[PDB]
Enzyme design. Structure first.
Site, mmCIF file in Angstrom:
data_model
loop_
_atom_site.group_PDB
_atom_site.id
_atom_site.type_symbol
_atom_site.label_atom_id
_atom_site.label_comp_id
_atom_site.label_asym_id
_atom_site.label_seq_id
_atom_site.Cartn_x
_atom_site.Cartn_y
_atom_site.Cartn_z
ATOM 1 N N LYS B 86 1.149 -1.297 -0.023
ATOM 2 C CA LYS B 86 -0.151 0.105 0.047
ATOM 3 C C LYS B 86 0.579 0.957 -0.109
ATOM 4 C CE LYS B 86 -3.943 -1.858 1.762
ATOM 5 N NZ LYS B 86 -3.964 -3.223 2.482
ATOM 6 N N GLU B 108 -9.557 6.672 4.794
ATOM 7 C CA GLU B 108 -10.356 5.229 5.038
ATOM 8 C C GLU B 108 -10.234 4.262 5.153
ATOM 9 O OE1 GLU B 108 -9.960 5.645 1.278
ATOM 10 O OE2 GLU B 108 -9.944 3.391 1.548
ATOM 11 N N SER B 376 2.234 -9.550 -0.993
ATOM 12 C CA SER B 376 1.623 -8.361 -0.669
ATOM 13 C C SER B 376 1.875 -7.751 0.573
ATOM 14 C CB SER B 376 -0.237 -8.059 -1.124
ATOM 15 O OG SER B 376 -0.910 -8.856 -0.512
HETATM 16 C C1 LIG Z 1 -4.697 -4.302 2.015
HETATM 17 C C2 LIG Z 1 -4.416 -5.512 1.655
HETATM 18 C C3 LIG Z 1 -4.553 -6.687 0.868
HETATM 19 C C4 LIG Z 1 -5.735 -5.913 0.130
HETATM 20 O O1 LIG Z 1 -5.650 -4.586 -0.879
HETATM 21 P P1 LIG Z 1 -5.958 -4.804 -2.450
HETATM 22 O O2 LIG Z 1 -6.348 -3.200 -2.751
HETATM 23 O O3 LIG Z 1 -6.930 -6.054 -2.512
HETATM 24 O O4 LIG Z 1 -4.115 -5.221 -2.767
HETATM 25 C C5 LIG Z 1 -4.031 -6.848 -0.353
HETATM 26 N N1 LIG Z 1 -2.876 -7.683 1.135
HETATM 27 C C6 LIG Z 1 -2.381 -6.771 1.557
HETATM 28 C C7 LIG Z 1 -1.379 -7.286 2.676
HETATM 29 C C8 LIG Z 1 -2.534 -5.203 2.018
HETATM 30 O O5 LIG Z 1 -2.671 -4.852 2.804
#
Ligand SMILES: *Cc1c(COP(=O)(O)O)cnc(C)c1O
Ligand SMILES: O=P(O)(O)OCCNS(=O)(=O)c1ccc(OC(F)(F)F)cc1
Ligand SMILES: [Cl-]
Ligand SMILES: [Cl-]
Ligand SMILES: [Cl-]
Ligand SMILES: [Cs+]
Ligand SMILES: [Cs+]
Ligand SMILES: [Cs+]
Lengths: 268, 394
Positions: B86, B108, B376
């Protein structure tokens, strides 16, 4: 039908403005809401604006957020709202009835079918709060095919192109926003709207109703003096409901007094 | 009128109150201008490199694929500053806010990851940050709430509607409707009204750009598929974007299956919801029969968005990308497997992507496939959640 056209012609004949309350359908329950609405009309409402409870009312401040929540606590559904609307029309043949909708409730089971249902129960207009003029085409087309006025919003800073669009596309009345932000009686609009009102008339727009933050007689008189055909008041009405939940009888008495005063301010 | 197309086929658009249209047009113009501005690009690159730590590693995971014809790499967004992808797009949106002369940020958050990312970027870049969070999320994400406050952000609990993410989304938009002249709304995923889906994609696309370069360096060819979890769609579209025109590369998005699709308790609107209009967009979403918005369920709080970005719905419709689901139990197994065999603790969000890759391998172990999972985020935050399940399970 032509209920707004006939109302505005009659009001012009009396050199009166329109006073238009907003309430949420089914707040605080179906039976009490029907009584509330009959009271508003008896006390002098010229037209109604009626909200269908929605999970995510993103143009509404806390007062109306809480009205939506009360209706849901009473189990109120869009289907029940349409039942209510048919009965209101059966009691009151000429008052214009407008709905305040959010897009998903209109799109849900098909846009055309939504407007056909509005026509069946005798609604006169629909304002979809989260559809700007840029996205309006399938809504306005469906509205007009079913003899429903699509209501467009004119923001206080609308440029010429937007004024022309709102004038062309809208019917019934033009919604003249008092200010930025969301609904609520705690914030009063402090921008002069007389230039917008003049430009709308130039472009043969539907007559303007000022709304957002209208909570007192002087505001109604001021709207009329500035050239608007009338004024809408929501949060101030809903506040009386909220205040009086424990006393349904006193709730109606207080609603009557308020609406009477607001309507009186519209005559001059 | 707009400079860019607000739709991906039928999906997307700008379903906001009229009062917000000038805000969206201003943001779109600023973005288009920024994308042509070498100085903006250099400032963004500098932050991404020297502050956030890009490029992130691409790790080959040899132990978990032993004895199969699967080669598996993990793109290590878990190693980015803040421990999730993010950070990338928050830095770019903060620079856009500055470009427009805004001094305030609204955001948000659900689980708190976007709130913390927004607060950190705001601290670094001198913006005053206020974060809306559903009262229910506030109560259950004490650590993230404390981080946001340490970083000087105001955290505002939302008690309306269901007091979760969609309600915080509403409150942010209500605030912005009245404050857009001075405040930028820093939306947390590749969803909402145009131009957000486009901006968030472009500010996350370095994930896939780096992955492509790294895999060509290490393997001499493109991947057979890239696999990413889908909450609102930002990490996935960030990985997918640079491969969209590489027709040989599979794009696989993994929605949360929760307790099982059949149970109704999931967060997979793209494949198991219904198209609706909400949060500024036309997109698949979790909703009742009569059109009230519902919540997404997942063991992973970060996959709680009750809809999905419109570009994903589009890529699905044309068959360019495929979307699948992974249950809580599958995600938990993948979490445990990575910890034990690769010495990496993955976010439970990311564990859904890994779980699907493990299925692709296990179901067809003699299929030759070069896979990349977008990792992610890191899973430090998830150890208590996993603790409580493993204990209650025995
Ligand atoms: C916020 C988040 C997501 C989900 O958000 P996306 O907009 O779908 O990428 C996935 N993995 C992690 C580690 C997150 O912090
Ligand atoms: O008196 P207030 O301040 O409560 O205002 C009453 C408003 N009730 S309404 O149905 O006219 C109404 C009109 C427009 C709205 O949003 C939009 F402008 F985006 F379309 C929301 C409600
Ligand atoms: Cl007209
Ligand atoms: Cl290159
Ligand atoms: Cl093979
Ligand atoms: Cs379209
Ligand atoms: Cs292998
Ligand atoms: Cs989701």
């Amino acid at each position: 039908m032509e209920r707004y056209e006939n109302l505005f012609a009659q009001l012009n004949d009396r050199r009166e403005g329109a006073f238009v309350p907003f309430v949420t359908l089914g707040d605080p329950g179906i039976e009490q809401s029907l009584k509330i609405i009959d009271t508003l009309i008896d006390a002098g409402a010229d037209a109604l604006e009626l909200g269908v409870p929605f999970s995510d009312p993103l143009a509404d401040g806390p007062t109306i957020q809480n009205a939506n929540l009360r209706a849901f606590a009473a189990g109120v559904t869009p289907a029940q709202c349409f039942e209510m609307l048919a009965l209101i029309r059966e009691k009151h043949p000429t008052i214009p009835i407008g709905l305040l909708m959010y897009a998903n409730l209109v799109f849900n089971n098909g846009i055309d079918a939504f407007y056909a249902r509005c026509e069946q129960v005798g609604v006169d207009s629909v304002l979809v709060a989260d559809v700007p003029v840029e996205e309006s085409a399938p809504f306005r087309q469906a509205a007009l095919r079913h003899n429903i006025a699509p209501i467009f919003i004119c923001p206080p800073n609308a440029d010429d192109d937007l004024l022309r669009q709102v004038a062309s596309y809208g019917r019934g009345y033009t919604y003249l926003l008092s200010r930025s932000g969301v609904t609520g009686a705690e914030n009063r609009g402090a921008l002069p709207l007389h230039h917008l009102i003049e430009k709308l008339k130039e472009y043969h727009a539907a007559p303007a109703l000022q709304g957002f933050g209208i909570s007192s007689p002087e505001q109604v008189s001021a709207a009329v003096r500035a050239g608007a055909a009338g004024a809408i008041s929501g949060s101030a009405i809903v506040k009386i409901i909220e205040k009086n939940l424990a006393s349904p009888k006193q709730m109606l008495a207080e609603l009557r007094s308020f609406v009477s005063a607001m309507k009186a301010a519209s005559r001059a | 009128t707009t400079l860019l197309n607000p739709y991906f086929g039928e999906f997307g658009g700008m379903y906001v109150p009229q009062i917000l249209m000038p805000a969206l047009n201003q943001l779109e113009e600023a973005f288009v201008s920024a994308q042509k501005d070498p100085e903006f690009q250099a400032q963004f690159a500098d932050l991404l490199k020297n502050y956030a730590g890009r490029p992130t590693a691409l790790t080959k995971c040899q132990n978990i694929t032993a004895g199969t014809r699967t080669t598996l790499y993990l793109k290590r967004e878990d190693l980015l500053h803040g421990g999730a992808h993010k950070t990338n797009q928050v830095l770019g949106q903060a620079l856009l806010a500055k470009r427009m002369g805004k001094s305030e940020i609204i955001a948000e958050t659900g689980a708190g990851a976007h709130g913390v990312a927004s607060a950190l970027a705001s601290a670094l870049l001198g913006l005053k940050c206020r974060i809306y969070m559903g009262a229910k999320d506030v109560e259950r994400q004490s650590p993230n709430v404390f981080r946001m406050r340490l970083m000087g952000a105001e955290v505002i609990p939302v008690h309306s509607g269901s007091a979760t993410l969609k309600d915080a989304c509403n409150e942010a938009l209500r605030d912005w409707s009245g404050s857009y002249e001075t405040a930028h709304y820093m939306l947390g995923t590749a969803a909402g009204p145009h131009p957000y889906p486009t901006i968030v994609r472009e500010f996350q696309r370095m994930i896939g750009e780096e992955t492509k370069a790294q895999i060509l360096d290490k393997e001499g060819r493109l991947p057979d598929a890239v696999i990413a979890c889908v909450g609102g769609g930002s990490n996935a579209i960030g990985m997918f974007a640079d491969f969209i025109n590489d027709t040989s590369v599979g794009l696989i998005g993994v929605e949360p299956g929760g307790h099982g699709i059949e149970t109704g308790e999931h967060g997979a609107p793209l494949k198991h919801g219904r198209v609706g209009i909400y949060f500024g967009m036309k997109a698949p979403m979790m909703q009742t029969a009569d059109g009230q918005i519902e919540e997404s369920y997942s063991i992973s709080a970060g996959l709680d968005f009750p809809s999905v970005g419109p570009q994903h719905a589009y890529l699905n419709s044309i068959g360019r990308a495929d979307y699948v689901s992974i249950t809580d139990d599958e995600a938990l197994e993948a979490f445990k497997t990575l910890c034990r065999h690769e010495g990496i603790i993955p976010a439970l969000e990311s564990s859904h992507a890994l779980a699907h890759a493990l299925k692709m391998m296990r179901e067809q172990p003699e299929k030759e496939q070069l896979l990349v999972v977008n990792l992610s985020g890191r899973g430090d935050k998830d150890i208590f959640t996993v603790h409580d399940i493993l204990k209650a399970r025995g």
